[PDB]
Amino acid sequence: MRNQELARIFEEIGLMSEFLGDNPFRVRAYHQAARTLYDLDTPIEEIAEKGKEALMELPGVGPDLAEKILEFLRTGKVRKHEELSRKVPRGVLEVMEVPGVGPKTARLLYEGLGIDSLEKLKAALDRGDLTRLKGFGPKRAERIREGLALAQAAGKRRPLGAVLSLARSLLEAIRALPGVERAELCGSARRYKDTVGDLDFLVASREGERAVEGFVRLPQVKEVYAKGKERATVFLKNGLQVDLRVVPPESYGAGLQYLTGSAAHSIRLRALAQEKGLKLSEYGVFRGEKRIAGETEEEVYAALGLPWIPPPLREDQGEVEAALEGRLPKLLELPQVKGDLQVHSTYSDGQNTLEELWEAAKTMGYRYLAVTDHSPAVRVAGGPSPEEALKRVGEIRRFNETHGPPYLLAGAEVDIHPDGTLDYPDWVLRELDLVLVSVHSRFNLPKADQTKRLLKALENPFVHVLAHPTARLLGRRAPIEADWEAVFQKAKEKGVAVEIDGYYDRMDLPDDLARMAYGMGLWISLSTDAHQTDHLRFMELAVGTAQRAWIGPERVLNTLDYEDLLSWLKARRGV
Numbered sequence: 001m002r003n004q005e006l007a008r009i010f011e012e013i014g015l016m017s018e019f020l021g022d023n024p025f026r027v028r029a030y031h032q033a034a035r036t037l038y039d040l041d042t043p044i045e046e047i048a049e050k051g052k053e054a055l056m057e058l059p060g061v062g063p064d065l066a067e068k069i070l071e072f073l074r075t076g077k078v079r080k081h082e083e084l085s086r087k088v089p090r091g092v093l094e095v096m097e098v099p100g101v102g103p104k105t106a107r108l109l110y111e112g113l114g115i116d117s118l119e120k121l122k123a124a125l126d127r128g129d130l131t132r133l134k135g136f137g138p139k140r141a142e143r144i145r146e147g148l149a150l151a152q153a154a155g156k157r158r159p160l161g162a163v164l165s166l167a168r169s170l171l172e173a174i175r176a177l178p179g180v181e182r183a184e185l186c187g188s189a190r191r192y193k194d195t196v197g198d199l200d201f202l203v204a205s206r207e208g209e210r211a212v213e214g215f216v217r218l219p220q221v222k223e224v225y226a227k228g229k230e231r232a233t234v235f236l237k238n239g240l241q242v243d244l245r246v247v248p249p250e251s252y253g254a255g256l257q258y259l260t261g262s263a264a265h266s267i268r269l270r271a272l273a274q275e276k277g278l279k280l281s282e283y284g285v286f287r288g289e290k291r292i293a294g295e296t297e298e299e300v301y302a303a304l305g306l307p308w309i310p311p312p313l314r315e316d317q318g319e320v321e322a323a324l325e326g327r328l329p330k331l332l333e334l335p336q337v338k339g340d341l342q343v344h345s346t347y348s349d350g351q352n353t354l355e356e357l358w359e360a361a362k363t364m365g366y367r368y369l370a371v372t373d374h375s376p377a378v379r380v381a382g383g384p385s386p387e388e389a390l391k392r393v394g395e396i397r398r399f400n401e402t403h404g405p406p407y408l409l410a411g412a413e414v415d416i417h418p419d420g421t422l423d424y425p426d427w428v429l430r431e432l433d434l435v436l437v438s439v440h441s442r443f444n445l446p447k448a449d450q451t452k453r454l455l456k457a458l459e460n461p462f463v464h465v466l467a468h469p470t471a472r473l474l475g476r477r478a479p480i481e482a483d484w485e486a487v488f489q490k491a492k493e494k495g496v497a498v499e500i501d502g503y504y505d506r507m508d509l510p511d512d513l514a515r516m517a518y519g520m521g522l523w524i525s526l527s528t529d530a531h532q533t534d535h536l537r538f539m540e541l542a543v544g545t546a547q548r549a550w551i552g553p554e555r556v557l558n559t560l561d562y563e564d565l566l567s568w569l570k571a572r573r574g575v
């Protein structure tokens with residue numbers, strides 16, 4: 001559909017027209033045309049095919065607008081929009097759209113103050129320049145600064161784990177709206193993508209317009225950006241940018257599929273539908289005018305002749321073909337994970353004692369937890385020394401002797417020196433239950449040198465896991481450059497697992513490299529890199545990553561029970 005694209009075009013024409021000081025009647029008309037297109041559920045092209053008169057039946061559309069609709073459908077553009085674009089630059093249009101600014105103010109700001117950009121706008125805000133205009137007080141001042149921040153965030157992405165719990169708190173409030181029967185967090189978040197744009201929620205309701213009203217008036221909501229009969233876009237007090245879509249309860253499953261995407265996955269499904277005489281839309285699966293499916297997502301997949309496809313797979317990267325042949329991959333599931341294989345403690349940089357870690361693991365129903373404190377070079381500190389590291393092993397063993405399950409594995413996260421040697425001697429490594437190795441320095445070695453360093457680390461027969469291999473920090477540090485094929489192949493041959501560290505701003509291995517490692521036949525270790533017990537919740541992110549990477553419970557260390565895990569760790573591994 002081109003409905004939303006055209007709604008935007010007319011809205012922009014309205015804004016630019018008002019900026020230029022066109023007829024307020026014409027300005028309001030463009031905005032009403034925009035609302036109509038925003039709310040219109042049927043494709044605008046289907047009405048356009050019926051003719052100019054049919055377009056004019058729509059609320060707000062007259063002879064002028066109907067010709068512009070046809071122009072857009074025939075050429076892909078509207079010359080009027082292009083004409084106003086010649087008179088109104090992009091930066092000045094960006095300024096006017098900030099909440100609390102608007103077209104007329106933007107004109108004064110353009111002509112009198114020299115503000116043609118968000119940059120200048122922020123400069124003015126920060127210096128108090130705007131306070132020297134009539135109509136400007138601390139209330140409007142606060143709105144404009146915040147509007148600017150929201151504008152600048154809308155381009156950008158945040159780690160999934162930075163926003164998922166906040167999204168779930170909003171989901172609770174949405175579910176609690178009277179009139180809402182079901183709701184779900186959809187979009188890329190439901191697919192467990194490691195960074196997300198806006199958050200998208202689907203609601204089932206028989207009273208959609210009233211559900212939208214309740215939603216936009218939730219205590220959590222700060223600003224409404226767009227609102228109509230069945231959808232809204234808002235900004236929360238906590239910053240989150242959120243889209244809502246409402247469908248009738250009979251359509252909920254089709255709405256879930258629609259709003260979960262990816263868009264590429266949905267293109268595949270719509271073609272499969274039409275190839276068997278059906279139409280898939282947000283509202284259901286239809287044979288002619290008759291709705292034959294829609295209430296549940298599994299019913300929708302079934303109507304297309306498919307098994308239900310897990311959301312993390314829905315990227316058009318082989319899942320449609322696998323579903324068509326009745327051979328979807330077996331995927332790791334969160335209940336199958338029996339422990340977390342990288343947690344830190346007060347022996348190094350963690351906030352928790354052994355007792356606190358044990359208690360948290362016991363609450364979670366884990367069989368074990370690996371306490372993997374840093375070697376001295378990681379912390380850029382003096383210790384723990386090799387002697388202290390061994391003393392700690394004895395303490396963890398005594399803790400297990402006095403506590404029982406969940407058992408603590410006495411581990412370490414051992415720094416890899418620039419030359420590929422390890423930051424504990426073999427007499428420490430051999431006594432550890434679990435040896436992780438990782439890069440914490442010299443992140444920018446030439447690719448060939450970084451590769452050699454990692455290969456040399458993997459020579460050591462006491463190593464079990466390559467921890468957070470790329471060392472990336474989302475928003476702070478790029479992945480290290482290394483030949484991952486060479487690194488993974490050596491790890492496979494040596495019996496060393498690669499880690500998926502689900503700590504929210506690590507997400508390392510990323511899904512794509514995890515998919516590569518698992519496809520090459522490696523073992524996988526999941527962890528949260530916890531430094532406080534609240535971090536243990538990130539295991540869901542590591543599992544979601546595994547699912548995106550087509551990883552099953554086979555060759556995942558965390559699906560082994562304690563005895564089987566210790567056996568794996570002690571075994572002659574590799575070729």
Ligand SMILES: Nc1nc2c(ncn2[C@H]2C[C@H](O)[C@@H](COP(=O)(O)OP(=O)(O)OP(=O)(O)O)O2)c(=O)[nH]1
Pocket residue numbers: 001186187188189193195196197198199200258259260261262263266
């Ligand atoms: N049929 C159809 N579905 C769409 C279209 N655009 C988006 N969708 C569906 C599939 C998307 O996964 C879902 C949410 O759209 P978003 O633009 O928010 O993307 P998504 O959440 O997947 O990724 P993001 O992290 O926000 O970049 O809506 C479209 O043009 N046609």
Ligand SMILES: [Ca+2]
Pocket residue numbers: 055056057058059060061062
């Ligand atoms: Ca009309």
Ligand SMILES: [Ca+2]
Pocket residue numbers: 175176177178179180181
């Ligand atoms: Ca409710």
Ligand SMILES: [Ca+2]
Pocket residue numbers: 187188197198199200
């Ligand atoms: Ca989204």
Ligand SMILES: [Ca+2]
Pocket residue numbers: 187198199200243
């Ligand atoms: Ca969206």
Ligand SMILES: [Cl-]
Pocket residue numbers: 252253256295296297298
């Ligand atoms: Cl469902």
Ligand SMILES: [Zn+2]
Pocket residue numbers: 413438467468
């Ligand atoms: Zn580390």
